[PDB]
From a paper:
Pyruvate carboxylase (PC) catalyses the MgATP-dependent conversion of pyruvate to oxaloacetate. PC is a member of the biotin-dependent carboxylase family and contains biotin carboxylase (BC), carboxyltransferase (CT) and biotin carboxyl carrier protein (BCCP) components. On the other hand, in a diverse array of Gram-negative bacteria among the phyla Proteobacteria and Aquificae, the PC enzyme is encoded by two separate genes, with the BC domain residing in a 52 kD α subunit and the CT and BCCP domains in a 67 kD β subunit. We report here the structures of the two-subunit PC from Methylobacillus flagellatus (MfPC).
To improve the diffraction quality, we introduced three single-site mutations (K419A, E421A and E422A) in the β subunit designed to reduce the surface entropy. We then removed the flexible B sub-domain (residues 131–201) of the BC domain and replaced it with a Gly–Ser–Ser–Gly linker. A mutant protein having this deletion and the three single-site changes produced a different crystal form with better diffraction, allowing us to determine the crystal structure of the MfPC holoenzyme at 3.0 Å resolution using the molecular replacement method with the SaPC structure as the search model. Contrary to the expectations of an α4β4 holoenzyme, the structure revealed a 370 kD α2β4 oligomer for the MfPC mutant, with one BC dimer and two CT dimers. The BC dimer forms the bottom and a CT dimer is on each arm of the U shape, leaving a large cavity in the middle. Of the three BCCP domains that are observed in this mutant holoenzyme, two are situated between the BC and CT domains, near the bottom of the U-shaped structure. Therefore, the BCCP domains are extensively swapped in the holoenzyme. The proximal CT domain active site is accessible to BCCP in the mutant structure, but inaccessible in the wild-type structure due to clashes with the BC dimer.
Residue numbers in the entry:
A (entry chain B): 338 to 471
B (entry chain E): 469 to 486, 494 to 511
C (entry chain C): 3 to 514, 527 to 617
D (entry chain D): 2 to 485, 496 to 514, 540 to 616
Write the structure that this text describes.
Amino acid sequence: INAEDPKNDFLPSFGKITRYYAPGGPGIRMDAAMYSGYVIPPYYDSMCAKLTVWALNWESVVERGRRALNDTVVYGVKTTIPYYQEILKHPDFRNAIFNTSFVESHPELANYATQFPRELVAAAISAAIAAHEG
Amino acid sequence: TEFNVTLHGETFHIKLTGQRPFYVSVDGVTEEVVVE
Amino acid sequence: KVHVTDVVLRDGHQSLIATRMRTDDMLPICSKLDAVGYWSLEAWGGATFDACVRYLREDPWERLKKLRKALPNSRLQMLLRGQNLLGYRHYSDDVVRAFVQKSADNGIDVFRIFDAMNDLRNLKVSIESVKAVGKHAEGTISYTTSPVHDIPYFVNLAKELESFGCDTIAIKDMASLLTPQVTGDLVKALREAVSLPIHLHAHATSGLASMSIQRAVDNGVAIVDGCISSFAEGASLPATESIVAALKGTEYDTGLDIGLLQEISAYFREVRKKYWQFESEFTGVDTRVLVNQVPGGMISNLSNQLKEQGALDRMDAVLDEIPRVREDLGYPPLVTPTSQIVGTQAVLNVMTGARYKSVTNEVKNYLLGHYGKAPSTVNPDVRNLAVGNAQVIECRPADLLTAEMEKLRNEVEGLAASAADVLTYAMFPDLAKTFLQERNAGSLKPEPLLDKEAVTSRESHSRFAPTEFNVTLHGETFHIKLTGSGHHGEEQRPFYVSVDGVTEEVVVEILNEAKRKASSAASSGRPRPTHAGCVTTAMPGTIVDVKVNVGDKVSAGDAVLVIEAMKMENEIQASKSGVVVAINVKKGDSVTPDEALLEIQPD
Amino acid sequence: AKVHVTDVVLRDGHQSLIATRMRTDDMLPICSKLDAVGYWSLEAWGGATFDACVRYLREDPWERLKKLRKALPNSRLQMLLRGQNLLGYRHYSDDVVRAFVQKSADNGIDVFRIFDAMNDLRNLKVSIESVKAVGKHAEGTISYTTSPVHDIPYFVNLAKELESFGCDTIAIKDMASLLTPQVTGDLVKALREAVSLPIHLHAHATSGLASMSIQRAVDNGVAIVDGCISSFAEGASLPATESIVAALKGTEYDTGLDIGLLQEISAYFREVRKKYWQFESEFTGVDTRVLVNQVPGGMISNLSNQLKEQGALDRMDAVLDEIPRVREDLGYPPLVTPTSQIVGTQAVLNVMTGARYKSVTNEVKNYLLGHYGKAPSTVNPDVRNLAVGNAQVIECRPADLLTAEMEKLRNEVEGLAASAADVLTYAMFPDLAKTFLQERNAGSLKPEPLLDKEAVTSRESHSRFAPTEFNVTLHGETFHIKLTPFYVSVDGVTEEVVVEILNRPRPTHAGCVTTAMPGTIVDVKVNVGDKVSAGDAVLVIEAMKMENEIQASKSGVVVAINVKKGDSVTPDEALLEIQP
Ligand SMILES: *C(=O)CCCC[C@@H]1SC[C@@H]2NC(=O)N[C@@H]21
Ligand SMILES: [Mn+2]
Ligand SMILES: [Mn+2]
């Protein structure tokens, strides 16, 4: 779980992590650098945490992967989570046959739906309240 | 009440109702807000 | 008629406040600088590149952009150290070419190019590159004195520099070694040997720079450097205004509005106060260069060196050893970098009790031809003691340097947003990495400027303030013992702290009456005026005579008192007509303008 | 040919830069060296020193002259005297001038530089005759200035008269640094043709031109030049003595002077001057504004201090604008003592008052009534009226109207004055001299002491630095603190606390050796200049109840050592340096 932005040729996304809720429940292990409020220094690598998922088999794991990635909630900095969800979605991967070329051989993986930030929705609402009150 | 808010390339259709809490519809999706 | 270049925006603050001037303090006054008829303004180059990055945490390429935009009509001038550029070492030819290209592209119009050793092989690429880009190349004789330097030596260098294709020739007296006599002859001998206009740049430290400029304009110098008066003199250059005033009326009259200059000077006078913390312990005329030619400011870094080691008592020795080492290394000019080199080696030799028993690695490189051609021949026994039989290279040291531009760009892929970022890296890679990193994270934090009155409080109570405490709470007491600084960069400064003999680093970041003007009485006890019949002085002093007794009838205008103030007598006279009610003053008393000295009842 | 040099350190130097506050005690230690340089003369006494010695230092200026005379045997001492004005701000009766010169001569003085603000040479003649009478050197002074009325011939005409009065030398006194080098060449030429006397240049440096001005002068045959030792030189002062000497070495004008001896003396003064930090003024540097407000160098650090005492430094810009306007009002007199105090003080009044000539000093009134002499140009009639009304302007040499008062004065001070000198001290400033003589005879003098540059600042001033709220980072955590036994808020949780009190360069290099943990040094295993390889025991430290050896990060040469046995260290400190 690197603090980079895959949309922008994986450019680093250093800065402050405003909110962080750690993933949990079964099959889930976290090994984190980061925490709530942590400010990622720019002199080192981008890795804020390693998320490590486990299940009794291939199908289950992948599902649990997808889950745990969402389960990991991180505001303030662009992360590779969304990108990973694309990988886990893609059938060649689920099918469990792949080699070093898989990423290169599938650039589409970075062209994904970037869900609109809850930090922006709150502003849009607050502006509706401002225009409604005076 | 029936606002259109254009924030950062996007527009959003907002409709309010009502420390006390509004209920608020973003593109026909309503949920509770609280202000303080 | 003489043209004038001002150096405020570069050499001025470089010479007097350690190159710490912000670009923010430069722009407000730019439209006026642009309005004066300056030949050029020295805006970029020298130590500013380093300082902008190292301490101000600003991108020097930005400063050049902004200054170029705010000084449209004026031609911007930079100082470049040949193959050394604005850096520490020689650079490969492809980087010199790229640098000059970017400096030109982004604003620079005039390039003053000099090399410490005067080894003109080191300038050629720069000069060809400046000519190539269609800009002004000012080739620089960096002046010094020694058995080898004489006027022909310099005119020979000036001829070569003309032959390389220079538009102007510059005399750079960094250490204020020109005497006015020499400066007349030299400029004469240069006007015969070269067809180019000449540029005098004479620092003021010895007191002769203004006399030196006079002799120069007499003998046909075309352009002269000065600094605006608020930053002028001493380690800086002669005051721009003073030059202008000394040529008004003459055949050399510079067409310059001395009042406009004065306005700008006042602006800078204000700015400079912010930078009090970088002012040099030694201000003004440092004649010492004139006993034995050791640059003042060389002796202030040498002493700064010896103090830290507890060894100031050896300076007299070191200054005797300095010229011997300079001689050993063939009378190079004592500028950066050669001055550090010589000075530190000299210190070693003294401490060791033996000449060249121990040898600085930079001295070795000097002796291996790495910096260039020593103006005189080096001592062979010293070379051999230091460097043995080893390869004294004899070519132009960039000859040994593979093209590095492609190499660097790869080294900084994913940081450098631009070619300029790559050239910044080139100058100081270790430092530029952290900078580029901090910039792209929006995390740059310039050293904040201190407030003068606040620092002085904390330092006076610094030997006095307590450290060992006992702190009691929740039943418990804790023995605490602090250590280390919190008055010199305290947001940056971390204590170390011992809780019951367990020491942990702490860091602190700061987040931040009974005085009565109101009272009826002045400090002295004497009443302040209640009403308008109360007689007052408008400036303090001592009472010479009271011309009136406790009850008298007085009409407005009557001499009531006399005071001496500013050594002058003044008869205070009655504001109002009527009766003298009280008199709260005797002959001899010292009085102040808020005190009421007599009272008078109107009508 | 050879140029002679006078140094002004002991008078004009500190008068121009630290408000005339230099003590005699700080002068004597370096006198034997001053005596050893080949100075033409030393300017030791006169000008504002008389006033300052009494008013502020509470020393008898006659004593200073005695001591300086004794400590500078081989050098000829020089004083500055303001003609009838002597060392005051008004004209004195002829019998007091004669008596003063007699006593100054008797007690040491060799050369008398005599000048008059107005240049009304009628005012110098008694002084010059009295100096000649006593068999001493009279240097008659053109006090230079600029205005629509002044020009070179005007000055050479004054030089001719001064030769005719029997002067040994003629002096050009550029008090306010108004000479341009061009004028100075022409003027000294035109003077060398019109007079047979050696010429003495005295050019304050405020405008930046004084050093260029001196060059042109020596080119055109000037004989003697004033400089100030470098520690007190430049700006409101004079050009650096050393700089002059260096700029003539080798030439036909070579002054035979040992620039290293000079430097030694300069260094002495550099140290002394630090004591006087409290009298230093922002306004003593190069300022080309002087070419118009025309305030003289000897004046400005005194004026500045004077405004400081009144809380009115913020008004200087105003005062300097007002000055040239009052000067014009009074017919373009040269701005020298005493005209410069007069104009300057009046200007100050006007500014403070918010009104021009609402208040008028008595000395301005006397000026307007012809009592200082003939104003070179015509005075503003409306100003005269506002100040002096219909009253009449005398046109004679104002001392003509002054009764001999010497015998009168001795009687006035019978039972105080211990000596004739004490009577002349009285004559300069009776009110002041009375209190002084009284306080002296009672052993009760109290000189304003010099302030300690860093006195321990009071407990009430320390608190405006001290913080109420701040962020403490302790062991990875930071904690928001707000203090108010203290009461103390840790992350918005307020807890009573009680306290009981109990009574080096950072590394630039990777070669700079550091501890990563603070402690005390037990042993340095290395001397400067050693060759060291990575992994060599370089230091030992005590920390955590143990001693342990720090070893070299890098190979190469030990360049410095910033630590000795016994020292306490912290990890940001660089303890030695090593060159790779
Ligand atoms: C008080 O005694 C301080 C000195 C008085 C002012 C000085 S006197 C010489 C200077 N000339 C002048 O007009 N004012 C200055
Ligand atoms: Mn320079
Ligand atoms: Mn003077």
